[PDB]
Amino acid sequence: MKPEIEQELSHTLLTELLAYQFASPVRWIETQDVFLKQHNTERIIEIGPSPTLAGMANRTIKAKYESYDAALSLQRQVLCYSKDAKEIYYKPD
Protein backbone atom coordinates (compact mmCIF):
# COMPACT_ATOMS: atom_id res chain seq x y z
CA MET A 1 0.00 0.00 0.00
CA LYS A 2 1.10 3.54 -0.79
CA PRO A 3 1.90 5.66 2.31
CA GLU A 4 -0.91 8.10 1.50
CA ILE A 5 -3.40 5.21 1.29
CA GLU A 6 -2.35 3.30 4.40
CA GLN A 7 -2.83 6.38 6.57
CA GLU A 8 -6.37 6.99 5.26
CA LEU A 9 -7.32 3.36 5.84
CA SER A 10 -5.86 3.64 9.33
CA HIS A 11 -7.28 7.12 9.97
CA THR A 12 -10.89 6.10 9.39
CA LEU A 13 -10.44 2.83 11.27
CA LEU A 14 -8.84 4.51 14.30
CA THR A 15 -11.72 6.98 14.51
CA GLU A 16 -14.42 4.36 13.96
CA LEU A 17 -12.83 2.21 16.65
CA LEU A 18 -12.76 5.02 19.22
CA ALA A 19 -16.20 6.43 18.44
CA TYR A 20 -17.89 3.04 18.67
CA GLN A 21 -15.82 2.10 21.74
CA PHE A 22 -18.19 4.54 23.45
CA ALA A 23 -21.16 2.25 22.73
CA SER A 24 -19.86 -1.31 22.37
CA PRO A 25 -18.65 -3.67 25.14
CA VAL A 26 -14.95 -3.63 25.97
CA ARG A 27 -13.55 -7.11 25.47
CA TRP A 28 -10.69 -7.13 27.95
CA ILE A 29 -10.54 -10.94 28.24
CA GLU A 30 -9.27 -11.65 24.74
CA THR A 31 -7.38 -8.40 25.01
CA GLN A 32 -5.58 -10.03 27.95
CA ASP A 33 -5.34 -13.23 25.91
CA VAL A 34 -3.32 -11.31 23.33
CA PHE A 35 -0.62 -9.67 25.41
CA LEU A 36 -0.31 -12.63 27.75
CA LYS A 37 -0.39 -15.40 25.15
CA GLN A 38 0.09 -14.17 21.58
CA HIS A 39 2.90 -11.80 22.55
CA ASN A 40 4.37 -13.60 25.63
CA THR A 41 5.04 -10.39 27.54
CA GLU A 42 7.22 -10.64 30.64
CA ARG A 43 6.77 -7.10 31.99
CA ILE A 44 3.12 -6.07 32.31
CA ILE A 45 3.11 -2.46 33.48
CA GLU A 46 0.00 -0.63 34.62
CA ILE A 47 0.04 3.15 34.65
CA GLY A 48 -2.77 4.53 36.76
CA PRO A 49 -3.74 5.62 40.28
CA SER A 50 -4.39 2.17 41.75
CA PRO A 51 -3.60 -1.32 40.44
CA THR A 52 -7.00 -2.19 39.02
CA LEU A 53 -5.39 -3.73 35.95
CA ALA A 54 -2.37 -5.27 37.67
CA GLY A 55 -4.75 -7.15 39.94
CA MET A 56 -6.87 -7.78 36.86
CA ALA A 57 -3.80 -9.29 35.20
CA ASN A 58 -2.81 -11.51 38.14
CA ARG A 59 -6.23 -13.14 38.25
CA THR A 60 -5.97 -14.05 34.56
CA ILE A 61 -2.46 -15.48 34.98
CA LYS A 62 -3.48 -17.82 37.80
CA ALA A 63 -6.73 -18.88 36.17
CA LYS A 64 -5.63 -19.40 32.57
CA TYR A 65 -1.82 -19.31 32.26
CA GLU A 66 -0.21 -20.85 35.35
CA SER A 67 0.46 -24.19 33.65
CA TYR A 68 1.34 -22.21 30.52
CA ASP A 69 4.03 -20.11 32.21
CA ALA A 70 5.57 -23.19 33.82
CA ALA A 71 5.77 -25.13 30.55
CA LEU A 72 7.36 -22.35 28.50
CA SER A 73 9.37 -21.04 31.51
CA LEU A 74 8.20 -17.41 31.44
CA GLN A 75 8.64 -15.41 34.63
CA ARG A 76 6.02 -12.71 34.24
CA GLN A 77 6.59 -9.62 36.37
CA VAL A 78 3.45 -7.58 37.05
CA LEU A 79 4.07 -3.91 37.75
CA CYS A 80 2.02 -0.81 38.49
CA TYR A 81 2.95 2.84 38.74
CA SER A 82 1.08 3.03 42.05
CA LYS A 83 3.24 0.61 44.06
CA ASP A 84 5.96 -0.78 41.77
CA ALA A 85 7.62 2.49 40.79
CA LYS A 86 11.16 1.56 41.81
CA GLU A 87 11.12 -1.45 39.48
CA ILE A 88 10.19 0.59 36.40
CA TYR A 89 12.70 3.42 36.77
CA TYR A 90 15.55 0.94 37.53
CA LYS A 91 16.35 2.57 40.85
CA PRO A 92 16.12 -0.53 43.04
CA ASP A 93 16.21 -0.66 46.83
Residues at the interface with other proteins (CB under 8 A) = 1-2, 5-32, 34-35, 38-50, 52-53, 56-57, 59-60, 63-64, 66-68, 70-73, 77, 81, 88-92
What CA–CA distances, in Å, run from 79 to 6, 47, 55?
Answer: 35, 9, 10
Residue 93 CB, nearest approach to other proteins (Å): 11
Half-sphere exposure of 19 (CA within 13 A, CB side): 6
Residue 59 CB, nearest approach to other proteins (Å): 5
